[PDB]
Amino acid sequence: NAMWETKFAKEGLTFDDVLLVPAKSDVLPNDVDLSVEMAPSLKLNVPIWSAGMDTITEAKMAIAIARQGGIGVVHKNMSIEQQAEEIEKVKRSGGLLAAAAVGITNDTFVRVEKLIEAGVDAIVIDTAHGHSAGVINKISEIRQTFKDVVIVAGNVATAEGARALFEVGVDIVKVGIGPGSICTTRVVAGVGVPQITAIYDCATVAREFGKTIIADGGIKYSGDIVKALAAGGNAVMLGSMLAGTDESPGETEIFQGRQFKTYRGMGSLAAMEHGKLVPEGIEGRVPYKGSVADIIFQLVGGIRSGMGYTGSPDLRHLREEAAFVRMTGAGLRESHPHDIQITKEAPNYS
Amino acid sequence: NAMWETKFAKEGLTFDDVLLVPAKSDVLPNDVDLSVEMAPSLKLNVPIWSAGMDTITEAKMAIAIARQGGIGVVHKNMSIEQQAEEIEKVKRSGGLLAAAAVGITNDTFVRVEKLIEAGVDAIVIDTAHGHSAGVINKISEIRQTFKDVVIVAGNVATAEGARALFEVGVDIVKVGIGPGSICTTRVVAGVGVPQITAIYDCATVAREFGKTIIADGGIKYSGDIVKALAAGGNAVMLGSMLAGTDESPGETEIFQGRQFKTYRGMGSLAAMEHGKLVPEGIEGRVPYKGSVADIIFQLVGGIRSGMGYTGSPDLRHLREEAAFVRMTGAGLRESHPHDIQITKEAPNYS
Amino acid sequence: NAMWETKFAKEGLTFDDVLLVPAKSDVLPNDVDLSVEMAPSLKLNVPIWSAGMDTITEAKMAIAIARQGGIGVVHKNMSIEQQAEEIEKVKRSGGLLAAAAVGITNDTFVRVEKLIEAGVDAIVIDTAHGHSAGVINKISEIRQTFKDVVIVAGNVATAEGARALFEVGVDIVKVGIGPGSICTTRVVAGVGVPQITAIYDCATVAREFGKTIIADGGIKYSGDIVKALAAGGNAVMLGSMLAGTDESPGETEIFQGRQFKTYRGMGSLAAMEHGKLVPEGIEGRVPYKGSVADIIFQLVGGIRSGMGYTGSPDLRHLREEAAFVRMTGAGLRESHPHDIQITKEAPNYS
Amino acid sequence: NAMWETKFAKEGLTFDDVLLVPAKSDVLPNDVDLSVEMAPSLKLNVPIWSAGMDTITEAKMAIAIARQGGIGVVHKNMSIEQQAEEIEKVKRSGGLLAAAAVGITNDTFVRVEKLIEAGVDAIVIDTAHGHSAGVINKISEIRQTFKDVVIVAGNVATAEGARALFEVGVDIVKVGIGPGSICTTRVVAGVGVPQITAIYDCATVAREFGKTIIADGGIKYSGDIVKALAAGGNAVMLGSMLAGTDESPGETEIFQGRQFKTYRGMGSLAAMEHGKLVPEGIEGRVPYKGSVADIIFQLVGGIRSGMGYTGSPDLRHLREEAAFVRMTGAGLRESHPHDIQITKEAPNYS
Numbered sequence A, B, C, D: 001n002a003m004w005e006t007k008f009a010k011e012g013l014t015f016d017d018v019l020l021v022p023a024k025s026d027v028l029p030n031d032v033d034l035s036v037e038m039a040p041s042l043k044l045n046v047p048i049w050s051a052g053m054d055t056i057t058e059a060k061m062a063i064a065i066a067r068q069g070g071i072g073v074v075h076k077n078m079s080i081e082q083q084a085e086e087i088e089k090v091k092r093s094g095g096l097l098a099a100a101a102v103g104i105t106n107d108t109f110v111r112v113e114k115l116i117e118a119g120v121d122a123i124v125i126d127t128a129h130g131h132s133a134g135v136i137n138k139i140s141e142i143r144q145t146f147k148d149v150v151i152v153a154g155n156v157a158t159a160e161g162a163r164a165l166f167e168v169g170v171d172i173v174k175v176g177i178g179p180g181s182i183c184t185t186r187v188v189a190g191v192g193v194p195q196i197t198a199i200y201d202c203a204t205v206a207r208e209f210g211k212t213i214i215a216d217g218g219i220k221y222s223g224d225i226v227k228a229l230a231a232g233g234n235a236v237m238l239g240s241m242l243a244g245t246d247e248s249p250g251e252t253e254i255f256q257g258r259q260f261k262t263y264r265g266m267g268s269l270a271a272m273e274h275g276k277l278v279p280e281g282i283e284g285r286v287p288y289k290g291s292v293a294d295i296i297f298q299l300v301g302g303i304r305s306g307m308g309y310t311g312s313p314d315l316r317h318l319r320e321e322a323a324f325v326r327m328t329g330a331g332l333r334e335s336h337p338h339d340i341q342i343t344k345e346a347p348n349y350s
């Protein structure tokens, strides 16, 4: 049995397993082009999507991140009327780009229709297991019903899963099973793929179709964005790094003389109340980060620095030509600050 | 010398070394079939055995877990009359399934006979080193004396050990040398096999015989059960995850304003008093977990979630067709929640 | 250049990298033979040498460990008259075995002569770098001067180093560069070999000569002794595990309501005062352990347990036939107790 | 696409991944030759450069380290007149060797000229990404303008980067992208090479040209210097290990009853104020270390000890002939002191 014999053949890498190799460079960081074409009708100035989560992205977040060159995915833990109204708030703030999450439920077709009426630019079909017959069949039916809307669908973590979604007309495949900071899928179900490998395997398929992927989950620092893009992601999706900003939906708390905000998985127990299956996320708090504009400024600055190191004048070169080097945990220790008592907080390092 | 030259050839994986790869799925988690045939006369509704330990399973535990679809192994740190009486309590609670542990001692044959008189469904011949001449010879003699009883025998961690036990008529081989949470076998004797590899090597033999194995020890989360089953285990045995429940034999203590219960290895010093050799277990305490019904509900929910991800409609497909991906410690860090202060305890994550 | 190209070819394992595989066994732990012939005139009942260190072995320690079946190496941080007098105390306690450490200094020949006059059974030529021209030349000269004395010489960590010492008539080669608990050789000089690999490479040479080796340093638990012997060591040398016993030279201190004893490297600054080069050891304290008899009882019990698991009826079988399995750090975590609050101290686990 | 297929082919090692193998030795540590020819006109008695950082090296540091056999790189976070004046202070302290850092800015040519007028011995062209067209072109122009000055240029971490700099007449290539203790390049930009591999790849090129390299960053102990030199570095550059000395520019602070000094990356926010791009360093404090003379004495003593172990009579033999052994994290744990409560601080181990 080939299936029995190859049970443990596959290997997987995540962000902390790899570094990008410096290469000959002709481009300064400030001259790098960060724009990316997600689909023929959807181009971003910076390759960053904000996560469709009820503690990350409502209209306030989507407005802030679109003004920085990204796009926000308004979460679906609200009525169809409310979610459409959030989209109208974004479009009425200068015609900014806006995306909106939908599930595979009995309201999906009406919800998509009202979101399109509100001016939405992308529909984000968000499911725990995108590589399933019922999901692929509904997606294909959505694709034929709404022929002109940009469709993001996920999540998958394998070539075969990304191919199954591109085959039914998905424009953008969202990649990531288990890497999220608030996620417990891998300890509760035992299922996942290390995220760098998942990006790489799915990007290989996306290139064959001429489409794009979103690297979703597990990003901890600006350098992880560069790794995610160089592994083949056309853009990334961020929760943890946008959590605790002014524009995120919560209100700040004071715990032990310091400001925090709530960040919780959409599969946590509390989040599923807001909208049977056992939880696959936890509920937590993160330190108050400040404004989205300031955070994106640091992220973008890390991407530009990385691309100056790799000689990437645009994201295409970073995706196609940047090489990695594998490292051990000892290499990870060398990569972070070591043998030093940090006295002042850096704006891009905690 | 081939033995000298191959001293370090073998490699071993445990649960934290691997993840299950998501695959094309046609089955929702709630429609998954969790039943397993351990032997022609013994079928379980959920593939879970409770450990034959004096701080895990007496009649109260065996009743609770059988009512959830599993089976309990009543421990043998009691007289023959007492252990038979515990079995009668289980059978008088609605004819529930019941198993009972026996050693290889001078009372084994009488103890097995009285347990069969009490209505026991499986005999669990529990030994530290199942792959030994004296144990295999007594087991074979038990097999010929009691021809119709389901026999579990262990523990082994190699193909040759599992084969030696199946060769003398053992119905179910219990697998695990050293992985137990309360176990020190590997630091005291230096002996063991990482548990995923041990399950896989033994399951390969079990398939040749048409018999089954129990993956015993080292399970920390519900996702480890899915890994254990996908590595070839027909069912798992749990101590740590059932420790501290209402139905476990101890009484709850209050330490620093919180409830705990005693959990100790059957090879710890205190456990061997209750029933020379140096200890191979420690004595500890675990937080109070609540009822067995609530804990099994979370475990079962993780198994169903995992099988929906792998597209396994029953445990046979999970055993034969699910693939793994290997990961580093960095991948393990990504798999658990990271970079977040958990504020609310999840029912399936500590 | 082959030397340039193979700079990083070699790989090395230590105790925490490996486990012993259980095998078919015909021998109970209590029936195992632990005796070992170190040289034609030197046989031990248990394969354990106590370290020649000024906080481990003087006459009191050598007496206690010889009474348990081992042999003690009286340290040389004392005059020739004093060290010879310590040996007389051992021989006057029932003719017990006794060994004594010598350096390569300008008193070595007189010191060896007086120790032989006192009845010493083995001379332990202790040097930091045994694989050096000056050391090998003095050793060869000692071998020809004292033709009938058992000679231990070390330390080396490679086949070529062990071969160089056996070539000049060394009876027993002591193996270990850097693994000691109190040792900083590897961080100060950058030099060493992981200890399991060092034992294995040197044992390969020892078998060709028909001689023996002592696995010296890095032993943390009784299971490490079994790994050390199965990797090819004929016996082990212990410092850390005998430190803090009643029979060790220090007096007990009380720190924060608990008893401790001093344990320090013979290359620490303080130890070199007692007897230029930069220190290669640290000075520390360990918890009070109790009597040597009780500690050896636990160690011996772990060895017997390990050999029952591997089916080794004597140490020859363990050396020649026991197989290992390699494991990751995740496997190490599974091997120790995990996910449990230990409440009672085990006699063989801290 | 070969670039796509080889995205993860490369592997990298750092100091904690490797140990030096002991070898046959004819040379005592005190007889080892530590001198190194960096360029035909620049020879050092010990192979150590002090880092060109505003919390490490001004005239006071450069004087102290030159008096120990090394050379100091006076940092450039000061005017041209001030930096030239610091160099005059060094030359007026007995004609000691002195080096000075320059950037690639609009003052570089005047700054180099005034530093040469002051008697500087080496120019250290310090850039974040030495493998860039603009940097290589300015360096080549500096080489043709100042034909007789020793030129150090960096930093690179690849063979192709080192080759590009040697091709334009650089005498000494400085190697290290990301390993620095105060450095965040690898987490902010995602870019780097584990330092042992980076030294080895660049040294391979340096040998073809007959030139030299400086191993810059990540050195934590004296043993790391030996590893860095044996991996092919002709000398090392130190920040962390010289930070907090009397001769470093800061003044000592008292924090919680203990003395500290400020150590900060030249890419930290505060350091860039002293002289847009996002920070790539943090600001911290280190314990007060004492005098440079005492620290160098310990470092040099570790190098001599290492070379006695490897049988290296001079640095050429260490570079060309010393072999390494690879180890896991378990091997790293064995290499440091373990299972001991250090009571007295060692002069070469924290």
Ligand SMILES: C[C@H](Oc1cccc2ccccc12)C(=O)Nc1ccc2oc(-c3ccncc3)nc2c1
Pocket (backbone or CB within 6 Å): A127, A128, A129, A132, A133, A134, A135, A185, A265, A266, A267, A277, A278, A279, A280, B025, B026, B027, B028, B029, B304, B305, B306, B308, B309
């Ligand atoms: C409860 C869990 O929730 C989540 C898991 C992962 C990511 C999340 C992100 C946002 C919100 C919730 C999330 C879940 O839906 N689990 C789950 C597990 C296996 C499944 O398998 C299927 C499925 C299989 C075959 N056909 C259709 C669906 N749905 C599944 C849902």
Ligand SMILES: C[C@H](Oc1cccc2ccccc12)C(=O)Nc1ccc2oc(-c3ccncc3)nc2c1
Pocket (backbone or CB within 6 Å): B127, B128, B129, B132, B133, B134, B135, B185, B265, B266, B267, B277, B278, B279, B280, C025, C026, C027, C028, C029, C304, C305, C306, C308, C309
């Ligand atoms: C003291 C130790 O106890 C246990 C070890 C491992 C798992 C446990 C689970 C429940 C209760 C006690 C356990 C033990 O029996 N150790 C031990 C070690 C090696 C042995 O080897 C043999 C043996 C070898 C050859 N023939 C017969 C028996 N019995 C052995 C017992």
Ligand SMILES: C[C@H](Oc1cccc2ccccc12)C(=O)Nc1ccc2oc(-c3ccncc3)nc2c1
Pocket (backbone or CB within 6 Å): C127, C128, C129, C132, C133, C134, C135, C185, C265, C266, C267, C277, C278, C279, C280, D025, D026, D027, D028, D029, D304, D305, D306, D308, D309
């Ligand atoms: C100071 C250090 O001390 C020790 C190191 C390692 C183990 C110890 C155990 C007990 C007591 C002291 C120890 C040492 O001797 N280091 C040292 C380092 C390199 C050497 O190289 C040579 C040497 C090389 C070539 N010929 C003769 C001697 N002796 C050396 C001594």
Ligand SMILES: C[C@H](Oc1cccc2ccccc12)C(=O)Nc1ccc2oc(-c3ccncc3)nc2c1
Pocket (backbone or CB within 6 Å): A025, A026, A027, A028, A029, A304, A305, A306, A308, A309, D127, D128, D129, D132, D133, D134, D135, D185, D265, D266, D267, D277, D278, D279, D280
């Ligand atoms: C802000 C950062 O600062 C440093 C980074 C690394 C080491 C440091 C050591 C001392 C002082 C500052 C350092 C930097 O210059 N980053 C940076 C990143 C990418 C770059 O790419 C280029 C570049 C690329 C192509 N042509 C010319 C320059 N310069 C770059 C500078």
Ligand SMILES: O=c1[nH]cnc2c1ncn2[C@@H]1O[C@H](COP(=O)(O)O)[C@@H](O)[C@H]1O
Pocket (backbone or CB within 6 Å): A051, A052, A053, A155, A176, A178, A179, A180, A181, A182, A183, A184, A185, A216, A217, A218, A219, A237, A238, A239, A240, A241, A264, A265, A266, A267, A268, A280, A281, A282
């Ligand atoms: O509770 C959940 N379980 C599993 N994954 C989740 C859950 N909630 C959000 N996610 C995923 O995790 C991503 C955010 O991960 P982060 O950026 O690492 O914090 C989201 O964009 C989702 O893809």
Ligand SMILES: O=c1[nH]cnc2c1ncn2[C@@H]1O[C@H](COP(=O)(O)O)[C@@H](O)[C@H]1O
Pocket (backbone or CB within 6 Å): B051, B052, B053, B155, B176, B178, B179, B180, B181, B182, B183, B184, B185, B216, B217, B218, B219, B237, B238, B239, B240, B241, B264, B265, B266, B267, B268, B280, B281, B282
């Ligand atoms: O003290 C002992 N020493 C070694 N293994 C033990 C001991 N007691 C119980 N076990 C094993 O450990 C299992 C429980 O492991 P856990 O589920 O990881 O807590 C039991 O089912 C036995 O197989």
Ligand SMILES: O=c1[nH]cnc2c1ncn2[C@@H]1O[C@H](COP(=O)(O)O)[C@@H](O)[C@H]1O
Pocket (backbone or CB within 6 Å): C051, C052, C053, C155, C176, C178, C179, C180, C181, C182, C183, C184, C185, C216, C217, C218, C219, C237, C238, C239, C240, C241, C264, C265, C266, C267, C268, C280, C281, C282
């Ligand atoms: O200070 C020293 N530096 C390096 N090795 C030492 C030093 N002192 C003792 N040793 C070695 O370390 C062994 C003890 O190691 P332990 O059993 O792991 O504590 C001794 O038998 C010596 O071989």
Ligand SMILES: O=c1[nH]cnc2c1ncn2[C@@H]1O[C@H](COP(=O)(O)O)[C@@H](O)[C@H]1O
Pocket (backbone or CB within 6 Å): D051, D052, D053, D155, D176, D178, D179, D180, D181, D182, D183, D184, D185, D216, D217, D218, D219, D237, D238, D239, D240, D241, D264, D265, D266, D267, D268, D280, D281, D282
């Ligand atoms: O802030 C910075 N970012 C990145 N690297 C730096 C920065 N400042 C200094 N370095 C490098 O780090 C080296 C010192 O590293 P350390 O010896 O490990 O403390 C310096 O010689 C520079 O090569």
Ligand SMILES: [Cl-]
Pocket (backbone or CB within 6 Å): A116, A145, A146, A147, A148, A149
């Ligand atoms: Cl449409």
Ligand SMILES: [Cl-]
Pocket (backbone or CB within 6 Å): B116, B145, B146, B147, B148, B149
């Ligand atoms: Cl029967």
Ligand SMILES: [Cl-]
Pocket (backbone or CB within 6 Å): C116, C145, C146, C147, C148, C149
């Ligand atoms: Cl003699």
Ligand SMILES: [Cl-]
Pocket (backbone or CB within 6 Å): D116, D145, D146, D147, D148, D149
């Ligand atoms: Cl010039």
